[PDB]
């Protein structure tokens, strides 16, 4: 739709890629497996990159010249989840890496001599402060900016 061309519903250049290139995968008139049970170009590796026919799903997917597909993601015509869908995903996963970073850490500096408890690991991964992340509804999006890590502690 935008700068490159249209998706899969038509993309001539893209078509030629499907075909030569891969199918020369062929290129081995035979190469012996008339019945034989190992050498697996034959089945998939192609067909798994291949039965990926005039279908790949359908994805929209813009495809420029040479027909390699380009990613716009400006939230329009079709392309929205090529950054946001896998974007918030990156955010959510990280941040629940470091929400617990700021956790199997803020749980130690106390009691009796706590000077490298960390070269061994008290609860592995934290396996206690663990889910605090999925057990983040809202969470730091409020309690970070109000109290605890409070401007005081700033």
């Amino acid at each position: 739709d935008i700068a490159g061309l249209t998706p899969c519903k038509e993309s001539k250049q893209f078509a030629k890629r499907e075909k030569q290139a891969l199918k020369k995968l062929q290129a081995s008139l035979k190469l012996y497996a008339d019945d034989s049970a190992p050498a697996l170009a034959i089945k998939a590796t192609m067909e798994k990159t291949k039965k990926r026919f005039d279908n790949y799903g359908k994805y929209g997917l813009l495809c420029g010249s040479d027909g390699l597909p380009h990613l716009i993601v400006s939230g329009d015509q079709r392309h929205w989840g090529e950054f946001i869908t896998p974007g918030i995903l990156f955010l959510y996963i990280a941040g629940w890496i470091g929400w617990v970073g700021r956790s199997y850490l803020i749980a130690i500096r106390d009691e009796k001599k706590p000077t490298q408890k960390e070269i061994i690991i008290d609860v592995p991964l934290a396996s206690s402060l663990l889910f605090r992340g999925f057990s983040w509804p809202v969470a730091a999006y409020r309690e970070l900016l109000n109290g605890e890590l409070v401007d005081n502690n700033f």
Partner: protein
């Protein structure tokens, strides 16, 4: 070092900060000693001032 011996533990040394030169890895925390430990891990100016073992 104990833990405590000489002679009079089988109870092995798993737990109590350090080992390797004597105002050792000190209580007080640091990182350098984590490349220490691996580097010079094999060496001999420490382990004991006495041949003996090393060849052993």
């Amino acid at each position: 070092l104990v833990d405590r011996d000489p002679i009079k533990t089988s109870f092995e040394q798993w737990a109590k900060p350090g080992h390797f030169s004597r105002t050792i890895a000190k209580g007080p925390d640091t990182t350098t000693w984590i490349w220490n430990l691996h580097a010079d891990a094999h060496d001999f100016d420490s382990h004991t001032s006495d041949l003996e073992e090393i060849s052993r």
